[PDB]
Amino acid sequence: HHMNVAILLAAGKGERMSENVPKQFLEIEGRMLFEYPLSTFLKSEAIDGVVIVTRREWFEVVEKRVFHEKVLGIVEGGDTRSQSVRSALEFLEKFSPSYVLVHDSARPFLRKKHVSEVLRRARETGAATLALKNSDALVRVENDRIEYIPRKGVYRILTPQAFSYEILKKAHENGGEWADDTEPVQKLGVKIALVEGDPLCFKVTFKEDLELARIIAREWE
Amino acid sequence: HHMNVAILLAAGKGERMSENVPKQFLEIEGRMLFEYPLSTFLKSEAIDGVVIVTRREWFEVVEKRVFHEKVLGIVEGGDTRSQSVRSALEFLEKFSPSYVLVHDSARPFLRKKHVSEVLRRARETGAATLALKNSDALVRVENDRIEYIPRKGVYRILTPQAFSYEILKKAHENGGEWADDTEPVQKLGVKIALVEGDPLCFKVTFKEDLELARIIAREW
Ligand SMILES: Nc1ccn([C@@H]2O[C@H](COP(=O)(O)OP(=O)(O)OP(=O)(O)O)[C@@H](O)[C@H]2O)c(=O)n1
Ligand SMILES: Nc1ccn([C@@H]2O[C@H](COP(=O)(O)OP(=O)(O)OP(=O)(O)O)[C@@H](O)[C@H]2O)c(=O)n1
Ligand SMILES: [Mg+2]
Ligand SMILES: [Mg+2]
């Protein structure tokens, strides 16, 4: 048996959204954003269990929307994404799960096929993430000039990301803060598998991102 | 001082879609992809004229789907985006527009808001583009080994991109090849106004993009 557990990150504050309420708890088509990806995991046969990571003040709001035997616990997040990840790893330690899938709840439109593909792709290498080839010109702003960044081999890292539990754990053993989990895992000399995603995997990050999420949400269920 | 013309670029081959039909002419909800941005320009009061740049053998396909006076013409593109843009500039010499707005037809879901907002903001420096702040971890591949790009100040550059006519002309007049038109214009020492857009401005570039195009099309 090789238990696969999914970690749903929903402890962030969504400061860049400029709303009262963290983005993951905004309603679209009558459900909170975090519910969309949650039920992809609950309907997914590749997923043996789920951990939802949120801030202490959101535990009840979550508890009252989630009744499913696959949910192993609601777990207190940290002040950062990486700390929220670590908090989940400590909770999962008692279960000794073989593989772990991590996903930003703010990417709500997660497909079944992506979950299973990233997990089997993590079986072979130890580490994998959904990703997307760049399709735009890319730039950096330096003191009122824009640098045009070279584009060959550039990819947006999405989530889900999936790892053998021991690898991801080993990578967080000494703390650290990163945007994602492939970065710390790679520091161990582990190759990161890229798995073709699509633009539905975008992260609701800014106020403008809501128009699009409502549009997909209308079609979803 | 005024006329604004949108240059709608539709002369690409879309070779990364791995179709046999360029993505601009793919049928979504009974309409070809170029029809969508086209109608935004047509329905838009900020736009006095439209030039459509396409490949010679697709001319009649484009003509057939033109139902409006506002379309000034159909120009034959070139083998690169830059060359296709230059093709249109030449055609427009006779129209003497004040500002030109250039837009990738493979970015189908353009809004009114952006067409006018991009043009307003092009007036201050003579150059502006729709842009989108990065919101993903970003990486570069280097032979079965990836590298993490620093994210500070990183934007995805979109279209529409609008310029004063004269300036764009000056940026292209010695030829050249670039992914967009802000880069050559900046080389002339012009500051580029970034205009905040949204993810609906994505460009249908890969096969995996079509589903999302279909979802949004159902709502137009
Ligand atoms: N302490 C944190 C911070 C981040 N996240 C999660 O990490 C994911 C991706 O991060 P991001 O989009 O940046 O979320 P926020 O931190 O909430 O957004 P912002 O930077 O605008 O505050 C989100 O699902 C978010 O809830 C988390 O679980 N715990
Ligand atoms: N010779 C060319 C090539 C590009 N474009 C236009 O530039 C826009 C954006 O470029 P891109 O996505 O790269 O289009 P393609 O070149 O067709 O795609 P590919 O790189 O796969 O061939 C498209 O709307 C395309 O029609 C153009 O008009 N003339
Ligand atoms: Mg954040
Ligand atoms: Mg191209």
Swiss-Prot record, chain A:
Query: Family per UniProt?
Result: Belongs to the IspD/TarI cytidylyltransferase family. IspD subfamily.
What PROSITE patterns has UniProt attached to this entry? ISPD
Q: Where is this site: Positions MEP for the nucleophilic attack?
A: R151, K203
Tell me which Pfam families the record gives: IspD
Q: Which UniProt keywords apply?
A: Isoprene biosynthesis, Nucleotidyltransferase, Transferase
Quick one: which pathway?
Answer: Isoprenoid biosynthesis; isopentenyl diphosphate biosynthesis via DXP pathway; isopentenyl diphosphate from 1-deoxy-D-xylulose 5-phosphate: step 2/6
Q: What is its EC number?
A: 2.7.7.60
Query: What is the name of this protein?
Result: 2-C-methyl-D-erythritol 4-phosphate cytidylyltransferase
Q: Per its UniProt entry, which superkingdom is the organism in?
A: Bacteria
Give the matching NCBIfam families.
ispD (TIGR00453)
Q: What does this protein do?
A: Catalyzes the formation of 4-diphosphocytidyl-2-C-methyl-D-erythritol from CTP and 2-C-methyl-D-erythritol 4-phosphate (MEP).
| Site (Transition state stabilizer) residue list | R16, K23
Which EC main class describes this enzyme? transferase
Q: Which GO terms are recorded in the biological process aspect for this UniProt protein? A: isopentenyl diphosphate biosynthetic process, methylerythritol 4-phosphate pathway
Catalysis: reaction(s): 2-C-methyl-D-erythritol 4-phosphate + CTP + H(+) = 4-CDP-2-C-methyl-D-erythritol + diphosphate
Q: Which GO terms describe its cellular component?
A: cytosol
Single GO molecular-function term?
Answer: 2-C-methyl-D-erythritol 4-phosphate cytidylyltransferase activity
The beginning of the lineage is: Bacteria, Thermotogati, Thermotogota, Thermotogae, Thermotogales
User: What Gene3D superfamilies does the entry give?
Assistant: Spore Coat Polysaccharide Biosynthesis Protein SpsA, Chain A (3.90.550.10)
Q: Where are the transmembrane segments?
A: none
